[PDB]
Amino acid sequence: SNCVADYSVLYNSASFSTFKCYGVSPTKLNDLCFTNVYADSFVIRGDEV
Amino acid sequence: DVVNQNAQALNTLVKQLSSNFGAISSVLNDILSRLDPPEAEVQIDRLIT
């Protein structure tokens, strides 16, 4: 939080396994700007997605 | 009594607008600003119904 969060820099990596949002539109990710962001960052096995 | 009956009917019709009706939210503007035109169809269909 308390920063500028661009998602066009999130989009240009075309190596994502599953690039899908469940809250909002995935093309509207730069459009809608949030209040707080909670990133649950971890590394697990590829079939548990 | 007739005046209060008319007033209750109008105020219930007003209070129906904030009802979620099973959709994600009640206000159409956030649904337009957060979902695709092939993805907002179901929720806007819920609200219209």
Added chain:
Amino acid sequence: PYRVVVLSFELLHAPATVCGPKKSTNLVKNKCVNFNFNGLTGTGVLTES
């Protein structure tokens, strides 16, 4: 192993601390404008409160 970042976020429960590179505009009053305040897509005449 896959890097998994669960991009979770809370929406419309606080003043906005996370907004990307969306350029602010000039505040115009008393005109039937299609404004965009805090993310919401509102439209109307903006009088000073």
